[PDB]
From a paper:
To aid our docking efforts, we solved two EN structures by x-ray crystallography. Previous structures of the wild-type EN at the time this work was completed did not contain bound catalytic metal ions. Since the EN requires either Mg2+ or Mn2+ for activity, we believe this provides a better representation of the electrostatic environment of the active site for docking than the apo structure (protein without a metal ion). Our previous attempts to screen compound libraries unbiased by AD2 used the apo EN structure and resulted in no compounds with in vitro efficacy. Second, we expanded the structural diversity of the compounds screened by using the structure of EN bound to Mn2+ instead of the apo structure, and were able to find additional inhibitors using LeDock and AutoDock Vina by screening ZINC subsets, including FDA and internationally approved drugs. Therefore, we used the structure of the EN bound to Mn2+ for docking of Groups 2, 3, and 4. For example, the structurally analogous site to the EN S202 is the APE1 W280, which decreases the size of the APE1 binding surface relative to the EN. In our molecular docking experiments, we included the full EN DNA binding site (area used for docking is shown in Supplementary Fig. 1a) to maximize potential interactions with candidate compounds and opportunities for specificity relative to APE1.
Numbering used by the authors: 4 to 238
The structure:
């Protein structure tokens, strides 16, 4: 009674510890997503083979040379994903996987933007990947930036760089899917102790044409990381 895919995004804050990988493996099994986007694996390109998660053996990774950044898209053993293209960031800040599930195209960009210059860094990735964006695109991960005023407890208006980022997303027919489903949401995914500020810096952005297929979306607090996850249910 179940042909809905669920895609999940989570900044995990490092996966070099095997015991930590087992906690993530159990958590993923509980959440039972079809597709899983992880940020900050902290796995070097040498160590990517260490990432094993029972039940999610299709794993696509982009990593740098230090124990820094690192992203991964995991696909459930129960989901038939046929890939056509995988594009990896050399520094491990993003990976794009294109393919299909059950004859329907899906383009997933998993992104981990740097703390500094985040909206400009994302705008540049969009430009670099311009030819690969389409109307079946999901962009999810740790943008390290609000996209609109309610993504921060301070309710500060977004900066010019963020505004230029949103214009570029608009040119690609991409929307903030979470806030379109929950326009007055005041939920958060990260807490900054130096300023006692709460912010939603993790995002699910996607093609306008996918909106009708998005059933549910919600945030998931956890004991694994300094970020809460976000889950999307798709038709
Ligand atoms: Mn971290």
């Amino acid at each position: 009674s179940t042909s809905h895919i669920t895609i999940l995004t989570l900044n995990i804050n490092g996966l070099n510890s095997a015991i930590k990988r087992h906690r993530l493996a159990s958590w993923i099994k509980s959440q039972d997503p079809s597709v899983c986007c992880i940020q900050e694996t902290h796995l070097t390109c040498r160590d990517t083979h260490r990432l094993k998660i029972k039940g999610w053996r299709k794993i696509y990774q982009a990593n740098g040379k230090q124990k820094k950044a690192g992203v991964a898209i995991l696909v459930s053993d129960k989901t038939d994903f046929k890939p056509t293209k995988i594009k990896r960031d050399k520094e491990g800040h993003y990976i794009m996987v294109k393919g299909s599930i059950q004859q329907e195209e899906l383009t997933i960009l998993n992104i981990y933007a740097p703390n500094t210059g985040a909206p400009r860094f994302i705008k540049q990735v969009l430009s670099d990947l311009q030819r690969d964006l389409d109307s079946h695109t999901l962009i999810m991960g740790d943008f390290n930036t609000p996209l609109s005023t309610l993504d921060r407890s301070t309710r500060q208006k977004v900066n010019k760089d963020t505004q230029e980022l949103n214009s570029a997303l608009h040119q690609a027919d991409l929307i903030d899917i979470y806030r379109t489903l929950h326009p007055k949401s005041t939920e958060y995914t990260f807490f900054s102790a130096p300023h006692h500020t709460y912010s939603k810096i993790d995002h699910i952005v996607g093609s306008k044409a996918l909106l009708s297929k998005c059933k549910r979306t919600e945030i998931i607090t956890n004991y694994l990381s300094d970020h809460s996850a976000i889950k999307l249910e798709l038709r």
